Every structure is written in C-alpha cells, then in structure tokens.
Design a protein around this nucleic acid. Structure first.
Length: 267
RNA sequence: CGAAAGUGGACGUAUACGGUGUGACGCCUGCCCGGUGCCGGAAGGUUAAUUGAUGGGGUUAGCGCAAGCGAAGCUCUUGAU
C-alpha cells in the first residue's frame, strides 16, 4: 500500500488472504432506487461466451449523465455497490432530489458538488469538456454529448485531456491511447473511485471466486473435440486457440463508423 | 447464439470484459527469431474481377470468264491498359 487507509490482510489460519473493506460509510443498508437484476449468462437458448454463474446478487442502483444542473448537491453518504468497485456516494439537492453518482476521491461529509456549465472545478459534478481547462483528471465522459458512458469503472480509472484542444475533440483514456470525442460532451471532472479498492486478492476460489463466476479455466483438458486441441500422451504441441480465434494477438475491430481515434502504439 | 431481427458480454465500460498457458508460497525463470505462426512496414516485383487498345478469322456489296481481293455492318477470337 501507500495511502490511507491500508487494506487489512487476513492471517494464516485457514488458507486465507487479502479481503476488502472501507473506512466506513455508516449504515449497512441502502435506499430504494434499484431494480431486480437478471440472472445468468445464456442467450435465449445457448450458453454464449462460456463462464458465468454463482449466486448472491440483486441491487441495481443508478444515475449517470447528470441532466440536472446548477442546483447544489450535498453528499449524503458513501455506499458500496455490487459487481462494480467504484463506491457510489448518495447526494441530495437543494430541492429534496436524490441521484447517486460515482463516488470520487475526496468526498464523504457533505461537500460542494455542482453540475451545469460554469461550476466549481473540484470533483463535484459533470461539466461540458468545453468548460474545462486541461482536465489532467476529468472522469466518465461520453462518446456523445448526451449519455454518460465511457469509463464508469471509476475505480482508479482516469482520463487526461490536452489543455486546450480545438476542433471540439480530445481525451486520453488509460490504455486506450489517444482518441478524440465530441467536445459538446461533459465530464464529472472529479475522476476517482479509490484504487486500493482493487488491490486485494480474492483469496482462494470458492468464498472469493465462485461468489461471482464459474471455473473460467479449461486449458487444454485434451479431448480433440471439446476444444481445437487435445489428446496427446500428456502434452500440447501446436496451436491452442478456441474456434480458430488465433490467440496470437491478431487484433480486430475494422472499418465501420468510429475508428477515427488517434495515436495508439504497439509497444 | 442467431439466415435476420434481436440477445448474451453488461443495465458492466480498461482497477472492465474475453481467450490462451502456468497452478499457493519461497528463490528463480538462462542462450536461439534460422523453421512455422503472429506483429509492424509496404517503397519495389507478382497478381483477381473490372475497362477492353491492337491484331487475326468468318460472312459479303462491289472489283473480276478465272485466280483471287475484299470495305461497312454483324459476328468469333485476341487480349494492350
């Protein structure tokens, strides 16, 4: 580690390792804006993209974009949302409203928080890229002006602009190299989500893995049929790609709309 | 997955999702890119459909006791580029 607060580390008692818990978000039990959630990985018939199972779920939760504007929010409390490790905060506006948001770093205890063109440049709320300096640290932008997609994976996930780019397009995703995006779009400007939140190890399958997805491991396993490689006395020799996918890099995504992003190296 | 619509991936979005191999942990993981595969380049050589230059043949108004020559059109071929 290197920050506050460090992450507990279970001690050797019954094959135990790193866990995950916060400083606190005082309460253990949510609000109400949520759905029911689907269930499995299967596609109206066949499995599709194997792997996917295990119980424990529910809890949908929401909010993105942030259509609402210049109306002062107040962070009600940080909160833990399933599947996605990016916390969530709560927030109440000065008119009893209550969206959710992706809990930035410095947040908790109330705080400023304002959206709309021309708003405090801290980590409050979304803001049209235009009305933003260099944004060495913006947030979950949107490929389009209205949406809120992009990097909702907040957890340590950032994005760097380029001070003042014209033509109305910029941004620099993580490994996404360079890529221009409509400047009439807005970014939370905060850009955080706590990294250590993703700095512990599940532990030992079962009570750490199974509680999410099935054995995502098949390896050769042999049996020249179940996979494009098998049999043999006890070893591999040859190619090992499933459905001649060709795991030798290859790359994909060709022609069509988009593909008008830039730079992108190859190491 | 599906002729498609659509659906899963995910109401997730690179600290995410997939595929491959190894299989806690400890100390480590050396030399070879010739072969095959993959990744980048793509200047030059070779090269598909496509357009179809140019020539060659058929037929025949006409020129002719005969020998043959044959335009224009239509055709069969040829294939530059």
């Amino acid at each position: 580690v290197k920050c506050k607060p460090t992450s507990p580390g279970r001690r050797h008692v019954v094959k135990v390792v790193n866990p995950e818990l916060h400083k606190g978000k005082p309460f253990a039990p949510l609000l109400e804006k949520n759905s029911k959630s689907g269930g499995r990985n299967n596609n109206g018939r066949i499995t599709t993209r194997h792997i996917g199972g295990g119980h424990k779920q529910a809890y949908r939760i929401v909010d993105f974009k942030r259509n609402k504007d210049g109306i002062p929010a107040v962070v009600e409390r940080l909160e833990y949302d399933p599947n996605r490790s990016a916390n969530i905060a709560l927030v109440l506006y000065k008119d009893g409203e209550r969206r959710y948001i992706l809990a930035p770093k410095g947040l908790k205890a109330g705080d400023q928080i304002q959206s709309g063109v021309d708003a405090a440049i801290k980590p409050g709320n979304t803001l049209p890229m235009r009305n933003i300096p260099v944004g060495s640290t913006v947030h979950n932008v949107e490929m389009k002006p209205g949406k809120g997609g992009q990097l909702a994976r907040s957890a340590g996930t950032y994005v760097q602009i380029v001070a003042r780019d014209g033509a109305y397009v910029t941004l620099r995703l993580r490994s996404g190299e360079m890529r221009k995006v409509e400047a009439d779009c807005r970014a939370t400007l905060g850009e955080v989500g706590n990294a250590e939140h993703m700095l512990r190890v599940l532990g030992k399958a079962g009570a750490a893995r199974w509680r999410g997805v099935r054995p995502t491991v098949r390896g050769t396993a042999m049996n020249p049929v179940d996979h494009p490689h098998g049999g043999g006395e006890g070893r591999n020799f040859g190619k090992h790609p499933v459905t001649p996918w060709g795991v030798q890099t290859k790359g994909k995504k060709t022609r069509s709309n988009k593909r008008t992003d830039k730079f992108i190296v190859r190491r």
